[PDB]
């Protein structure tokens, strides 16, 4: 039986990067040839194992963390990387065993008039620990006086929605990013 990469990569809808969707993949054969030879994934490189060499090596648990980010911070999805998404939204550990697939999705996610469904965490007290999923939308306090969850000065809602437009440039287009992580029932 085949591993269900078709329900991840060819899915109808993704999730935003603060609530990044994680699905555990196990007890199946993972055919990676349809991923590498698809010729549609623009950004693809692999850490800890060569991508043409991981086809005949077997892991135990595979997590396919998937989200939608702007095309500039695809470089932020990397081990040992500092930035905005890599600190407040989705941090990869330094010992990251697995790899990242990012392809352009202007033709689906960037609708006419602006797409504001996708938000990213912008204000946070501390940087994220690796593989942390933060769902809380409490009104962030940046100053001394707490302001009890109402909007105002030094009271910022931490999720700023992306402005995704077909008019936007290549760096501002939405890129559906799928991140694979590896650790013995996921063979090739």
């Amino acid at each position, epitope marked *: 039986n085949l591993c269900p990469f078709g329900e991840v990569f060819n899915a109808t809808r993704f999730a935003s990067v603060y609530a990044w969707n994680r699905k555990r993949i196990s007890n199946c054969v993972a055919d990676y040839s349809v991923l590498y030879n698809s010729a549609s994934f623009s950004t693809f490189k692999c850490y800890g194992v060569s991508p043409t060499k991981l086809n005949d090596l077997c892991f135990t648990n595979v997590y396919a963390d998937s989200f939608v980010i702007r095309g500039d911070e695809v470089r932020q999805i990397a081990p040992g990387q500092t930035g905005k998404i890599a600190d407040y939204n989705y941090k990869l550990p330094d010992d990251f065993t697995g790899c990242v697939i990012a392809w352009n999705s202007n033709n689906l996610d960037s609708k006419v008039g602006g797409n504001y469904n996708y938000r990213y965490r912008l*204000f946070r007290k501390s940087n994220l620990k690796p593989f942390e999923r933060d769902i809380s939308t409490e009104i962030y306090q940046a100053g001394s*006086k707490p302001c009890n969850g109402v*909007e*105002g*000065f030094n009271c*910022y809602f931490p999720l700023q929605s992306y402005g995704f437009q077909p008019t936007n440039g290549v760096g501002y287009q939405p890129y559906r990013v799928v991140v694979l992580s590896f650790e013995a029932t996921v063979c090739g």
Partner: antibody, heavy 121, light 107 residues
């Protein structure tokens, strides 16, 4: 720790102004700039404020429909353009910033600009 | 929400004790009534933040006291360069972080 502002612009009652305010010595964190318009011989006023990291501008009620107060984190700047530039707009425009001490931010607009003699001639 | 300040000129001698007060017309939320001074025609600068705290880099002789609506700016030692227009703030509310009329510290 200095906000270098643009120079004066002598304008006309049909035109629009474009006042910039660059932040020197540091980069924009979640710093919440405000903008203060001073007609000479009058009190200070309030134009609007930008959360610079978010870009959520919010202008005052008499300025509700004809000033857009934009910011750019890439250049570490924050702009202002006021529409229709009436004869009761000859003033000095002050970009006031709240200092953020990383771990947190302050509650006071301490570092200011230097002024912009927006002249309506 | 509008902020009214108190006496429009402090016409009294240098080198003594003066009190400055901002009588708000609506109650200031979270006590955010920072105090600025502005010598006429030049850039203002901050003295009191969060309605009581002394600012960083600013020396002594100023004091913000009280919270809510009753409010005091306490200047201790009027040097000749403290004869300046002094301003409130209400950047606490939402919109119209309304200033004051100012006053005139006068000899």
């Amino acid at each position: 720790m200095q906000l270098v502002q643009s120079g004066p612009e002598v304008k006309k009652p049909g035109t629009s102004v474009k006042v910039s305010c660059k932040a020197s010595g540091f980069t924009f964190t979640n710093s919440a700039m405000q903008w203060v318009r001073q007609a000479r011989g009058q009190r200070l006023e309030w134009v609007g404020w930008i959360v610079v990291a978010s870009g959520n501008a919010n202008s005052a009620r008499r300025f509700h429909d004809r000033v857009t107060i934009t910011s750019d984190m890439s250049t570490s700047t924050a702009y202002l353009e006021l529409s229709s530039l009436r004869s009761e707009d000859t003033a000095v425009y002050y970009c006031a910033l709240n200092h953020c001490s990383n771990t947190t931010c302050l509650d006071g607009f301490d570092i200011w600009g230097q002024g912009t003699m927006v002249s309506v001639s | 929400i509008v902020l009214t300040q108190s006496p429009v000129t402090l016409s009294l001698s240098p080198g003594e004790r003066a009190t400055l007060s901002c009588r708000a017309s609506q109650s200031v939320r979270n006590s955010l009534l920072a105090w600025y001074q502005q010598k006429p025609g030049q850039a203002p600068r901050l003295l009191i933040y969060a309605a009581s705290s002394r600012a960083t880099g600013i020396p002594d002789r100023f004091s913000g006291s009280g919270s809510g609506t009753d409010f005091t700016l306490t200047i201790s030692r009027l040097e000749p360069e403290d004869f300046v227009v002094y301003y409130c703030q209400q950047h606490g509310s939402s919109p119209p972080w309304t200033f004051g009329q100012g006053t005139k510290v006068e000899f």
